[PDB]
Amino acid sequence: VFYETFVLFSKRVQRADIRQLLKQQEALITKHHGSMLAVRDLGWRKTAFRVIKPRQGIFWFGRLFYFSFGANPAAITEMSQSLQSTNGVLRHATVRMKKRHNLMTYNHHIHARD
Amino acid sequence: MSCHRHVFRAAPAAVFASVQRWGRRNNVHKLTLLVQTYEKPCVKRTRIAEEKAYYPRWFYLRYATEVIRYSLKHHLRLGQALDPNDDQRLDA
Amino acid sequence: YIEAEKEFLNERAQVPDAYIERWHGEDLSKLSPALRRCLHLRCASSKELHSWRKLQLCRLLQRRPFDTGSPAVQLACLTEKILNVRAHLLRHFRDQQKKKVLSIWLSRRHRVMKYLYRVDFNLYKYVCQQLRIKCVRFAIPDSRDRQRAISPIAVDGDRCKFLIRQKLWKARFRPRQLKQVDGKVVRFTRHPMEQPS
Amino acid sequence: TLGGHPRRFKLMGGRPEFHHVDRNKNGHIIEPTDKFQVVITTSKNNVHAQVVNKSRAYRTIFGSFAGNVGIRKQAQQGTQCAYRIGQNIARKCRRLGISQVEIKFRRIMRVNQLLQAFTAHGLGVTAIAHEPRLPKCGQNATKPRKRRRV
Amino acid sequence: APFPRGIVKPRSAKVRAILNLSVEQRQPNPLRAPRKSLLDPPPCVAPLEKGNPKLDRQ
Amino acid sequence: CSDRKRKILNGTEYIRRKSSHRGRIKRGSQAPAFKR
Amino acid sequence: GRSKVLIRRLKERAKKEAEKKA
RNA sequence: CGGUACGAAGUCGAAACAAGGUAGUUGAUGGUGAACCAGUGGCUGAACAAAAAA
RNA sequence: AACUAGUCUUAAACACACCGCUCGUCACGUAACA
RNA sequence: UAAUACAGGGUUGAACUGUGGGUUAGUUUCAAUGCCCAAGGCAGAGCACUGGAUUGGAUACCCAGGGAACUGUGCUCCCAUUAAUAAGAAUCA
RNA sequence: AUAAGAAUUAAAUCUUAAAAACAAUUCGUUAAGCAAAGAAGUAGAAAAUAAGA
RNA sequence: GGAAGUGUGUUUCAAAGAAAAAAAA
RNA sequence: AGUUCUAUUGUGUUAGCAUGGUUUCG
């Protein structure tokens, strides 16, 4: 089963932290028999509102990352719990990849008709 | 959310009236009154049924009154059923 | 009882070494080994595994390659669906609608078996043998006595020994009261099920 | 019938206006570059109006209410009390040196009187904001109070 | 739209008129009853005005 | 149901009939419950 | 009401006294 | 024993029918000289009030 | 903003028509069941 | 009623199938609140009860406080018991 | 005692009080339990329920 | 972090406030 | 009608989350 995960790291997060988190996620995928498909960086984006992350602070933007992976359905709960426990991550969401409207295929001309 | 209005080259009374209109069309007072006190589920069922039955009638009668006012203002006459087979040809 | 339930759940959870839907060697060769692993049944969901098992039963008991409506194949698929729903209920014991769905499917399977018995007796016996389900016979009309009546629940009782029988529990047959270790007296509404012979 | 808060009047320490208000490190209550917001909280029985300096981290400067203007008991429910509170706020703003303010409130009832008093007494209004903070979770997430008269 | 958690099933004509969009009488079903016609006899009701019967030809 | 529901409405059954629904005043059922 | 508020007031008073002592 | 039906109209209140002056009634309850009252969940065999569109 | 006369709408268990209809305890005799 | 996991049902199409059904007790899965039991136990609100008023008078309506009840594969189906006035066939373009 | 807050048809109980940390109003921050406000026309298939007053 | 400005990537205030009313200057 | 697959899921049970009335802390 294919899935896409979107993460929003804070400014305090570093490249080393991102690499560590991705390594942990790939370890979970391999444990659940899956395989990481792709990883991409969607740039720095301002939040629609200030994120008050308790015991971490207040943030006004974040760096957005995306990774797509095929894995057994049982891995999603573990991945979600791990991402929630991670400190730097501000927000995360994992969804089932769709045939047409997915970042792997429907990745260009999402706003420009011509 | 909270509506923000700028009182610039206008009357504070007019701006307050616009804010009141926003509140009325958003049902803010209705929700505040609802949450000020406990409403049992059956009462809510009856109220929602009543509203869903009532408001379309009000909208239709509002449209009818708008048409009546327009016709009175423009001195319009009552219509006659369009007779078919009328050539509708210009007298020229 | 608990051990039998655990055995059934484990057997249902077992994942064989095969792929999903109808992918085969040439289809899977084009992809990379990682994506082929993603296709493999280990990554597959419970629905895909259930569909694979139903496909295998169909290929076993089918008239021809695409025969899925013949009463034998219908019996196999209904049995598989009943087993899948029973496992799902053992997990989500609070899902009430699925018990109703299970009862409906038991009735449908009973009707399919009744039809196939008359239509083709030898094939009916063969299908029951292969499915390891009780080969109920409909030579004469069933009875109104629950001690003699057919049990669509008791069918496929080889898999689950807890779906076999139960002691009478109404009126004079109700279980008697027992004093527990805590010192309070409790009466069971049902007789604790004993392993059938 | 003093027209004010009896206890504040009695305990007034020599009557220096704004004697008890903390001041900046420069010794000024109001900087020449400060903006002001009047927050009004209305209800059936009373209206609480607070003038706040936005520049000083939205810090309350002074406030007024029915007791402060000298209205007690049932008289606090009428529109006269709301207009009196508005007049008091406008006059004190004029004394301090506040001319233009931004209005904010949660319940819109009993706010027209305050706005009219402000306009009459020269307290200009630059903007109006209605912040009802309506529930965004449900209607009985916390069981509200029982309905009166059963 | 709102979520009332179920619907209501009143039986009386009064409550049905209150709680339904319209209670206009519809055309009779051609499979059940005949169509209304101008020749149908009028109801046998005495003409009354403010409770007084108006029964006099002159 | 006519006389039966009349007895239910006037409350004779409420007094004289056991109820697996229990209640603090109604007679209770000490046996496993089944639809009759 | 008048139970939780009183209990929390007493709790805050005790906590402040203890912290000042410490 | 407790309850129940008939005749009589006596004392005490005014529970229902109008928004019956606190909508009614219902399931199982708690409380009360009486009708009844209170909470909770049901119904309507209830009312009042009731949107134009930015 | 209130009142009377209307006039209109709605509700009604009122129709001798709200000075209506109507509930119950207690008291009071004749009885059946238990 | 966001995503995710596990299961239905409905709708549309292809294939399969070939009167294989309509109704249903000596049947039993589920089912508001309350009550019994178990859990927890002070976010809110809230019987009994307390005391602040109105009333000849209230054991109520109003106000303040409130240890009963408010989340369970348990016990369990009383009802103004859940999409209606039982389910199916026929009559209509 | 008293005023203020709160409430009420009007009052009272209740909370704070003498320069304020939580009576009430404004501003931040977490914490706790709880969870149908917003998005679906019972409308339009000819589709229609009960002789009368 | 609050409030602002434009020779700038600038300045200012700043980790709770609030203790008659009505005026003069 | 039924079985299989197909596209869709304001259906039922689900670990966790975003938001919010209320109370709370300063």
From TrEMBL, chain A:
Residues of the full protein shown: 50 to 163 of 163
Keywords (A to Z) from UniProt: Ribonucleoprotein, Ribosomal protein
Gene Ontology biological process terms, A to Z: translation
Native species: Toxoplasma gondii
Lineage summary: Eukaryota, Sar, Alveolata, Apicomplexa, Conoidasida
Protein name listed in UniProt: Putative mitochondrial ribosomal protein s6-2
MF-aspect GO terms: small ribosomal subunit rRNA binding; structural constituent of ribosome
GO cellular component: cytoplasm; ribosome
The family this protein is said to belong to: Belongs to the bacterial ribosomal protein bS6 family.
Automatic annotation (TrEMBL), chain B:
Domain of life: Eukaryota
The protein's name in its UniProt record: Uncharacterized protein
UniProtKB/TrEMBL annotation, chain D:
Top-rank taxon, per record: Eukaryota
TM annotation in the entry: none
Protein name: Putative ribosomal protein S11
Residues of the full protein shown: 244 to 393 of 393
Automatic annotation (TrEMBL), chain E:
Portion of the full sequence shown: 2 to 59 of 235
Keywords, alphabetical: Coiled coil
Protein name as it appears in the record: Acylphosphatase-like domain-containing protein
Superkingdom of origin organism: Eukaryota
